[PDB]
Design a protein around this ligand. Structure first.
Ligand SMILES: CNC(=O)c1nc(-c2cccc(-c3nnn[nH]3)c2)cnc1N
Length: 833
C-alpha cells in the first residue's frame, strides 16, 4: 500500500458514498473477491479504449432517420452554423455526410487540430458518422431548431488518464433466534421456515415446531430435507424465514463463489417486513447489529414430432411472459426440449421447465446450452433477453446467454435500458457476474453511459441496505478505471448535490403545513443560497440528468420554494459556457419527500415507449424530463421551460374552491401564441401530446391524476409529472382538453378525429411489443415498489395491453376508454374534495 493510495480510496469513498474496505457486515470473502475479480475486465476495457473518441463521446445512432423528420429536410440540405469568438458563417450540408468531411468544406468555402462542438454543450459532432446520425442533429430537427456549433480544439486525451493499480440429504441446524426487544405487541407464537430456493422456485421446504415468541427462542433441532447434497444447484439460496405472519427473512447462499458448500456456524442478522419483491432475494445481512432479529444455524455437510403436440408446443411458446405454465406444459417443453431450442422465444419458458434440484437434469440442461447455434444466430430481442435476467432465472449459464446477446446493443440502446439492466443486478445470485462485468464494460467504454451508470449505482447504494455493498463494489470498479477527468467532475457533482440537499432539508423543517411562504422563509432560503454562493459552491458543475450542460452560479432572484407540502426548491442556474447562444436558465428542482426511484423507472419506460413509436414513425411528443434520485426520498428534477400546471391555468379569473370551465386552456394558448399559424402548431402539438400521455399512462396504469400533476408548455406540449404517487377514470382527457380539440358537448371534430387515429396507432404500436413492456413493468414493480402482488398487480398491464385480442377488439377497447372518460368530464377532477 501507500498513503497516498488510501487517500485515493478516501476520495473513491466520497464518490461511492460507502466503504468497500470495511468488512463489518460480512461472513465470507465475496465482496473483496469481486473487487479483485473486476480488475481484469476493468483493465482490458481501459486498454481497448480509443482515446480520442473517448474524450469526446460522440452520441450517435445507427437507427434510420425517421420519416417525420425526413419531411423537415430541404433537397438533402441541412443548415449548420459554425462560430468563432465574435464570428459565424453558415454552411449548407447533406444529411449523409461526415464531420470529418465538413470542416474541410468550411476551410475551402471562404491544420486539422479542430472539431465541430455543439454550442453551449460539451458535445461533439466528431468521428465517422453521417451528421444526420448524431443525436443533437436529430434533436435540433424535431424541435424545429437551429444547429449551432463552435470550432475549437479537441480536448486532451491526457486529461482522461487512468492511474495505475455425497448422497446424504442436506440439513441445517436451527439453534435459535435472538432479538433485544419484542414490544411489537404483547406476545404470540413463532417458527423458523427453512426453504431451499433457486429462481424463486422453492425446491424443498422444512420448518421448526412452533414455540413462544420471547426475546430469545432456542430449538435446537435438525431439519432434514428431501434434497441430496450432490443435487443442490449452484445459486441455491438457503432462505430462512420467521412467522408468527411473516416479519423477518435472511438468505445464505448454500454454494459460495468458490463452488464450495457453505459449512459451519452462522449468526445471521435478518430484515423486517413493514407495511414477490427483489429485496427478499438478497445475500446481504442487516448491517444494524443493535436492533435487528438474529438467527443462528450450523451447517454440517433423432425422432420426429406428432402433428398436434407441435401445436400445443407452439401454442405454449406463443403465450405471454405472465402466462403460468402447468406441470403438463413444463414436461411437454422438457421432453421436446430439442425442438424448443429451435425457437429462441421458447427459451424463457423452457429453462422455466427445468428441475434445477436434479444434478442429472441440470446436466442435460447444460448439454443443450452447448447447442446455441440458433440462439447465437437470432437477431437481438431485448424483451426476450430481459426476461432471462429476472428473478425466475438463477442459473449463471442461462443468465450468461442473455448477456451475450446484449453486446450487439450499441451504446444508444444501452442508455434506453441501463437503469433496468442496473436494476437486474439485484437478481444475480453472486456479486461478480456477466451482467455486472457488462455494465462496467459498457460504462467505461462511453462517458455518457459511465455517467448515468454512476448516478444509477450511487442512487441504490445511497438508500438500499439490501444491495449497497454489491453496487458499491461495481461502482468502485467503474470509478477506478473511468479517467481522472471524469473523477474530478464527479467529485464536484456530488459536492454540489450534498450542499443543495442540506439547503432543501433545513428549509423543510423550517416550514409547517400552512400554505404560505413567509418572508423569513424566502429570507433564510434567499440568504442560505447567497451565504452559499459564495462559500463553498464550485464555479461550475455538470448537470446530472443532462451532462451536456454545465451550470455556474445561482440566479438567486429566480430561486424560490415551490408552494407545496414538501417545499421543494426551484433553483435556476447561470450557464458556465459563454458560447451558449441564449441566456435561458438551467432549472433544477431539488426535493425531499417522495421516492424518486419510482419516477426514474416510469420515465425510462416512457423513453422506451417513444423509441418504440420511432420504429413505426410516430412522434407522440412526450416530455420525459430529467430526474436523478440521490438518497432516501431525495433528488432532483429538470424544470421544463415555459411550462404551467393545468390547475394553475384553471385559477385565472376562475377563483379558488370554485372550478372549472370547459374553455380557458384555449385562451391561455392564444394568450401565449404570437401568430395564428403557430397557435395551430400548438393545437397539433396538443393533440399529439395528449394522445401520447393517454396511451402511455393507460398502459403503465397511472392515468387517473389530479390536474396539478399535469402541465402544458406554451407551445401546446402536454405532459405528466410527479409520478410520486402512484370513482376511477383510465386517463386525464377532461372537457378542457376536448375544447381546443373542439367538440362541446360531445359530438366530433377533425382534431378529436385525428386524436382518435393517433391514440389507436400509438396503443397498437405499443402492442407490437407486449412482451418487452410486461417484462419491464414487472421488473419495475419488483425492484422499485413496496406493496406488490406477483399476480394481480403485474397482471394489470397484460389486460391494459389487451393481451390475446386482435387489432379490432383492441381499437374497440381503447376508444371506449376514451369515451368512458367523456361521460364523466370533470367528475374525478372536482372530486379532489
Ligand atoms: C409548477 N411546476 C413547474 O413549473 C415544473 N414542474 C416540474 C416538475 C416535475 C416533476 C415533479 C414536480 C413537482 N411538483 N411538485 N413537486 N415536485 C415538478 C418540472 N418542470 C416544471 N417546469
Amino acid at each position: 500500500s501507500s498513503e497516498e493510495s488510501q487517500a485515493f480510496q478516501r476520495q473513491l469513498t466520497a464518490l461511492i458514498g460507502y466503504d468497500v474496505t470495511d468488512v463489518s457486515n460480512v461472513h465470507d470473502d465475496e465482496l473483496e473477491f469481486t473487487r479483485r475479480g473486476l480488475v481484469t475486465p476493468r483493465m482490458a476495457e481501459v486498454a481497448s479504449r480509443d482515446p480520442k473518441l473517448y474524450a469526446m463521446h460522440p452520441w450517435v445512432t445507427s437507427k434510420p432517420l425517421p420519416e417525420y423528420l425526413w419531411k423537415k429536410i430541404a433537397n438533402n440540405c441541412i443548415f449548420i452554423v459554425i462560430h468563432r469568438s465574435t464570428t459565424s458563417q453558415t454552411i449548407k450540408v447533406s444529411p449523409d455526410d461526415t464531420p470529418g468531411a465538413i470542416l474541410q468544406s468550411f476551410f475551402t468555402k471562404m491544420e486539422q487540430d479542430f472539431v465541430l462542438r455543439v454550442c453551449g454543450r460539451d458535445e461533439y459532432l466528431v468521428g465517422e458518422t453521417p451528421i444526420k446520425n448524431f443525436q443533437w442533429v436529430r434533436h435540433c430537427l424535431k424541435n424545429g431548431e437551429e444547429i449551432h456549433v463552435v470550432l475549437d480544439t479537441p480536448p486532451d486525451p491526457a486529461l482522461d488518464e487512468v492511474r495505475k493499480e455425497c448422497d446424504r440429504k442436506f440439513r441445517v441446524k436451527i439453534r435459535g433466534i435472538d432479538i433485544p426487544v419484542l414490544p411489537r405487541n404483547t406476545d404470540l407464537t413463532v417458527f423458523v421456515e427453512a426453504n431451499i430456493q433457486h429462481g424463486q422456485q422453492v425446491l424443498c421446504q422444512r420448518r421448526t415446531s412452533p414455540k413462544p415468541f420471547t426475546e430469545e427462542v432456542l430449538w435446537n433441532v435438525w431439519l432434514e430435507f428431501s434434497i441430496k447434497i450432490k443435487d443442490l444447484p449452484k445459486g441455491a439460496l438457503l432462505n430462512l424465514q420467521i412467522y408468527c405472519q411473516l416479519l423477518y427473512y435472511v438468505n445464505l447462499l448454500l454454494i459460495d463463489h468458490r463452488f464450495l458448500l457453505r459449512r459451519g456456524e452462522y449468526v445471521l442478522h435478518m430484515w423486517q417486513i413493514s407495511g414477490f419483491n427483489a429485496d427478499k432475494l438478497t445475500s446481504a445481512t442487516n448491517p444494524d447489529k443493535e436492533n435487528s432479529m438474529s438467527i443462528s444455524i450450523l451447517l454440517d455437510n433423432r425422432a420426429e414430432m406428432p402433428n398436434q403436440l407441435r401445436k400445443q408446443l407452439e401454442a405454449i411458446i406463443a403465450t405471454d411472459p405472465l402466462n403460468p405454465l402447468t406441470a403438463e406444459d413444463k414436461e411437454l417443453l422438457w421432453h421436446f426440449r430439442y425442438e424448443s431450442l429451435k425457437h429462441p422465444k421458447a427459451y424463457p419458458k423452457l429453462f422455466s421447465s427445468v428441475k434445477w434440484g436434479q444434478q442429472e437434469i441440470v446436466a442435460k440442461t447444460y448439454q443443450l446450452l452447448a447447442r446455441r447455434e440458433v440462439w447465437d444466430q437470432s437477431a437481438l430481442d431485448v424483451g426476450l433477453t430481459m426476461q432471462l435476467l429476472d428473478c425466475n432465472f438463477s442459473d449463471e449459464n442461462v443468465r450468461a446467454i442473455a448477456v451475450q446477446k446484449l453486446e450487439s446493443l450499441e451504446d444508444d440502446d444501452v442508455l434506453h435500458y441501463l437503469l433496468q439492466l442496473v436494476q437486474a443486478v439485484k437478481f444475480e445470485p453472486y456479486h461478480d457476474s456477466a451482467l455486472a462485468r457488462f455494465l462496467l464494460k459498457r460504462g467505461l467504454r462511453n462517458k455518457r453511459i459511465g455517467h448515468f451508470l454512476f448516478w444509477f449505482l450511487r442512487s441504490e447504494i445511497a438508500q438500499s441496505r439490501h444491495y449497497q455493498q454489491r453496487f458499491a463494489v461495481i461502482l468502485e470498479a467503474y470509478l477506478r478505471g473511468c479517467g481522472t477527468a471524469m473523477l474530478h467532475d464527479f467529485t464536484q457533482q456530488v459536492q454540489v448535490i450534498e450542499m443543495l440537499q442540506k439547503v432543501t432539508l433545513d428549509i423543510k423543517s423550517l416550514s409547517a403545513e400552512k400554505y404560505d411562504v413567509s418572508s423569513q422563509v424566502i429570507s433564510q432560503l434567499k440568504q442560505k443560497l447567497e451565504n452559499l454562493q459564495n462559500s463553498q459552491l464550485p464555479e461550475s458543475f455538470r448537470v446530472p440528468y443532462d451532462p451536456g450542460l454545465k451550470a455556474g452560479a445561482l440566479a438567486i432572484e429566480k430561486c424560490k420554494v415551490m408552494a407545496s407540502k414538501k417545499k421543494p426548491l426551484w433553483l435556476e442556474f447561470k450557464c458556465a459556457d459563454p458560447t451558449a447562444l441564449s441566456n435561458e436558465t438551467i432549472g433544477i428542482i431539488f426535493k425531499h419527500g417522495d421516492d424518486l426511484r419510482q419516477d426514474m423507472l416510469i420515465l425510462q419506460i416512457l423513453r422506451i415507449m417513444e423509441s418504440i413509436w420511432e420504429t413505426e414513425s410516430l412522434d407522440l411528443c412526450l416530455l420525459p424530463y430529467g430526474c436523478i434520485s440521490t438518497g432516501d426520498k431525495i433528488g432532483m428534477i429538470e424544470i421544463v421551460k415555459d411550462a404551467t400546471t393545468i390547475a394553475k391555468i384553471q385559477q385565472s379569473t376562475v377563483g379558488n374552491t370554485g372550478a372549472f370551465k370547459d374553455e380557458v386552456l384555449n385562451h391561455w394558448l392564444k394568450e401565449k401564441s404570437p401568430t395564428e399559424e403557430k397557435f395551430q402548431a400548438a393545437v397539433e402539438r396538443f393533440v399529439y401530446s395528449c394522445a401520447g400521455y393517454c396511451v402511455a399512462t393507460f398502459v403503465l396504469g397511472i392515468g387517473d391524476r389530479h390536474n396539478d400533476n399535469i402541465m402544458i408548455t406554451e407551445t401546446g406540449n402536454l405532459f405528466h409529472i410527479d409520478f410520486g404517487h402512484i370513482e376511477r377514470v383510465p386517463f386525464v382527457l377532461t372537457p378542457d382538453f376536448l375544447f381546443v380539440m373542439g367538440t362541446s358537448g360531445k359530438k366530433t371534430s377533425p382534431h378529436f378525429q385525428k386524436f382518435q387515429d393517433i391514440c389507436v396507432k400509438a396503443y397498437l404500436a405499443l402492442r407490437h411489443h407486449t412482451n418487452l413492456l410486461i417484462i419491464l413493468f414487472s421488473m419495475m414493480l419488483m425492484t422499485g415498489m413496496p406493496q406488490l402482488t406477483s399476480k394481480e398487480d403485474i397482471e394489470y398491464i397484460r389486460d391494459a395491453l389487451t393481451v390475446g385480442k386482435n387489432e379490432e377488439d383492441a381499437k374497440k377497447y381503447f376508444l371506449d376508454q376514451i369515451e368512458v372518460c367523456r361521460d364523466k368530464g370533470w367528475t374525478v377532477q372536482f372530486n379532489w374534495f
